């Protein structure tokens with residue numbers, strides 16, 4: 001029963017699943033620290049972001065609820081294989097790292113905003129987060145190293 005993870009029950013199907021309250025990931029199978037990790041991310045900003053502006057939009061006006069809907073939609077397409085994380089990050093991430101397919105490079109604890117850092121270090125290599133909230137907006141995080 002690894003830390004961060006809990007058992008839960010599907011409302012629609014009644015089948016057990018597992019949920020991580022640090023990364024907001026959820027999955028059906030029973031789940032399986034380094035100085036540094038490397039992550040990519042897809043950021044969707046909203047009107048309450050620290051700076052409501054990006055390379056995509058001079059004035060970001062979408063609500064925090066609308067931003068969460070967009071994040072949820074991207075997660076669905078990534079999990080179905082219909083779209084690649086890197087493709088969606090390049091097209092739709094409100095972070096300048098979109099130009100690098102979302103790649104932020106490597107970082108230690110104490111550099112990123114805390115909810116982002118905690119989710120990044122709690123992911124296993126290759127694992128992707130659910131929606132992660134920071135003062136910048138809502139993130140999907142992919143731990144690559």
Ligand SMILES: O=C(CCCO)NCc1ccc(F)cc1
Nearest residue numbers: 095096097098100103104105106
């Ligand atoms: O430089 C890299 C990747 C480095 C090698 O892995 N990405 C560009 C970038 C990173 C963080 C940003 F906040 C904005 C842009």
